[PDB]
Symmetry: C7
Subunit: 222 residues, 7 copies
């Protein structure tokens, strides 16, 4: 319906301008004589930029070796996190940790940070010990005992950092940090370490007679 | 009204400049003699870029096979999630899970991650068991019993990961994870598994005599 | 005032450079002799890009048929949601559900997902049943009764999905999902179905003697 | 101080390269002989793009008529909301509802959704009735009475939608919607309608003996 | 160290390709004979775009008069809010309301909304009266008394809007709006008006015997 | 491995097309005869744009003087906040208030707002006095006493604004503002003023017998 | 399947237009005779921009020295934070503090702020002392004692700032700041200082007999 409107308006204006009035002079204006092939050729290479970008980065990642097949990857700027299964010239395929596929233009990789935890040395452990303002006295001996517990712990890479320190206050909690690594990289082993650690911690706290700290409040009634 | 203003100002300036004063010299400045067809031709191919991009990516997805018809898709960077019903040269049509249609320029796909859970191997299960700080003693035996329960569970792909581990503390809760897959991909079967699982879990907890953990607080009165 | 500054500085520098000193040589530098028409012509087609984009997409949506007049539309990437009332070559007009007008450049549509619920097959129903941790025992029989209730329900498209399953825990609630469609698309009919459904649900729960679940907490006093 | 550094380094390198050593050959490299006028002319039309865009869209909105003077406008993608007071070729002026002025490049409008509630037909009313889980029994009769109240209400456009339906559960509340329009567009009249409506509603609820619902919780003590 | 690597690899490949093997043919490839001045000249005008944009918009704001010196400005899209102290060709200087300076490229202004409250007519007043669900009966007489109080108030521009209406429910509160302007623009006068207003309001409420509404909740114990 | 695939596919197609079939005609297509130096030269000046932008803005900030060495700077659009230590042609170096270094492309500055609190006149003070709804009566005398306290305060620039006014209600609090400047700019002096001020305020409140306001709530039990 | 559609439609239209009708005239339109090599050559240098950008910035960071190997880095605009292990011409490699690798295009660095805490002078300490409104009297003597404690503290760089001042009120807390540096940069030493500090603080508070402040509320019952 609307192209009828466009064509009818153009046909109306032209036929009226050339029947009511009629052109004494002659204009040489050809809608189709314009040889300017050049325009579409020009337009070819511009139009296809994502694909062109993909082949370049595919080549480079075929030479540059950020990651390899079967390596756990993550990105900190995009939700791109799994294991490589394949490369392509333009895009790769990842199995997510949902055992699901992920198809990805590689041109993305050119301007984005990239991480390979499957290349890493070790895994990390951190926690925060919510302790009560009541328990302020015993903090140093708790921490020190705690540091010793980790230092006598086998699964740790003692040559990596080991930090046990009351770093900050908080709302109704006195938060001691933890920062320890494992000389393993096996997820399950790391978690077993984490578990036994937390348990030994709790043993230590409750052995010192102090207690952890929920959120807390102070009320005035009426 | 305003084109009257523009045209009147131009006509005023010109007619005044050419009647009050009048040009002794002669300037050859033609508003219409400029042959530069070239400009509009140039402008053609630039103006139509989204459409041009759509045809290219349509061709490529006709060759490249990220997804196929009738496959559940999702994206992690856009709310694009349903089942394909059709392809076009430029855009496709998805039925959402609202049984609603979705029309989409394919040029988008060129620079965006893509997922095909309908191609996947399996489905996933995870949970977090909110346990009370009181219940710290029984955690290992609970977990181990729990691990055994899953390992004796039929619907699981035991060859896929099976992680039951106290991964973190929290506000008033001791959170044990769960990470288990199903050798099925049928949504309803997966959910039935999930249901029976949760029930067996609860049985296990309350059989151990411990209890789950709501949010909790500690109050000081006046 | 400030053009006085610009012109005065230029006039000062020039008149001083040509009166204190005066140019022995002769430079042929003409501020106006530059024939380069080419620049403004070039600038014409570039300057007007939004309008140019609008006409193209207007043509395509006149050929491509994402939506039609009088169809409820929504977008998931922009707050664009109403019923079409009109097309234009460049922009359309929507009545929002406020019975208000909305004027829109069509060039937008080229690079944006689009939805036509007024083309859909059916409408959807979902809910989440907040149940108490106390009520863990009766969950399966509740669900099953509930599934039967829907299956014996007339207004449902039983050939579409029907999922009743305890999908997740939560803070102080055991959340059973619901996922059911209606073979209607009439908003009001859909809502009447929804209403009667919720009522039958509540009847079922309270007939089983269990109860729903508010948010809950656990307090320790002093 | 720093241009002394730049010029001194260049002068040092050159004078040393041409006094310690001295050029046997002769290079014809002129810092100023480059006739390439072309560069600045090129740069003219590119540099001024926002202004160029403003004039185009000013013309089009002088032809295209999204809005008119004295019309309440809003945008859903930008905080642009008031009444037009003026047009310009490039920008317009809005009085906000703070009785404050707003000056705006019109080029913005080319690629942005636009709304004219001052062109609308009617105004809207919606609410959500927080009812208690206790009150589940009386919901249908409440709703139906409520629907009748609106239907017997004069200021309503009964030919527009009238939806009164229990659409969703919530945290400690059973939320019934409302969706009704007014055949007026006068803000104050609309509000008077809204007020009397809410009052009649409350009368209806408390006449049925049920009650509304605050947020609520369930506590376990120690 | 690394340029040694680059240069050494290039020198190694070349010297090996021209000593182990040696070129029978002769290639005329000159790293420096390329006359293409054109490239750097081209690059000049492109490189300096922000500065070029600043001069243009500086000229226009020297002609276009969005704001003037000493005028309070704000933007709704950027945290740009103070009083002008100066103009420049490219950038201006604002004193913030911290009595601090702010230096700003003017090119920004070309594509951004702009506001001049220092040009305004009047200032605004709004509030929301949190009333209890208990107090539903007295709402109309309260509002009406309240409307009268404002109407008999001197500092108001009664010819501007005056809206006192129960616009919405809320969590544990019945929220009546306020919308009134002052025929002044002096900040301090406006605030004195606001203060005395709020006081008269409170007098009115507590004179009617009703009361305001905090957040509230409803508890079920165990 | 994959370049073997690319090269092998090309070699396979070509050798098969030229051995199974063989070209009767002769095509003059040279992969290397293309003289188009022009492409890489073109590409030079485009590729290096960030660096080019940095030198320009470095020159301008060497002429334009937004900031100087040793001046506290901040930006409202980026977390760029410290003291200048150095300029470069392309980038500068800031010491943050962590006594840490910050290296920055200057091209950024071209299109970003900029602030120099180290150039300012004075520092600012503001607060909000949470008062209880009970205390509504005494507000004016409190404020007035408070205004007098500041007016008799030495360290204030009384010629700058001094606003003490009940500006808004809130959840369980009646919030009076404060807006006062110091004729100093020394951080520590400003803070000492702030401290003594707050103390005098508290003295004033508790001398009037009223009290501040925490968050508050209203409970209904069962 | 779909290329069959495209090719079949084109073949159908052409063969029908040239068999049903047949071209009396002769058009010289060659799909392959277009010599315009120029297009792909043009497209080469444009397509590869990320890589080109990487080499430039690699060179510059090889000359410009923001950071060096083994230096802790962070960015305030991206989650880019670890220790350098390597440089490349285009990208570098960071070990995160997870002992994980990070591969990064250097072109990013050109337009982004950068920080080198491993180059810093010192580390920082800050805290906020939540004190009760009850404790308003003792604030100055507490602060002053506290200032003295730090001033007599060895590990501090007393020549750097030392600020102890009641800077703000808050919800149920009177918040005194802390701002002190350490003449060390060793993480663990800094934390040991922090720990002993916090302890001395607590000693000071509880020695003054006042107490810290949790969140607090004020309740009205029914």
């Amino acid at each position: 319906x609307x192209x009828x409107x466009x064509x009818x308006x153009x046909x109306x204006x032209x036929x009226x301008x050339x029947x009511x009035x009629x052109x004494x002079x002659x204009x040489x204006x050809x809608x189709x004589x314009x040889x300017x092939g050049g325009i579409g050729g020009l337009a070819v290479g511009m139009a296809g930029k994502d694909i062109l970008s993909n082949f370049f980065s595919g080549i480079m990642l075929y030479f540059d070796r950020p990651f390899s097949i079967g390596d756990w990857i993550r990105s900190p700027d995009r939700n791109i996190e799994g294991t490589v299964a394949e490369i392509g010239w333009r895009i790769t395929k990842i199995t997510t940790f949902d055992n699901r596929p992920l198809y990805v233009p590689n041109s993305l990789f050119s301007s984005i940070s990239v991480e390979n935890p499957g290349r890493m040395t070790n895994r990390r452990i951190t926690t925060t010990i919510g302790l009560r303002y009541e328990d302020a006295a015993k903090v140093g001996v708790i921490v020190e005992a705690v540091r010793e517990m980790l230092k006598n712990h086998p699964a740790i890479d003692q040559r990596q950092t080991l930090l046990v320190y009351f770093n900050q206050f908080a709302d109704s909690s006195l938060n001691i940090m933890v920062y320890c690594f494992t000389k393993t990289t096996v997820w399950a082993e790391w978690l077993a370490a984490q578990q036994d650690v937390y348990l030994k911690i709790i043993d230590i706290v409750q052995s010192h007679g102090a207690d952890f700290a929920f959120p807390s409040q102070t009320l005035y009634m009426d």
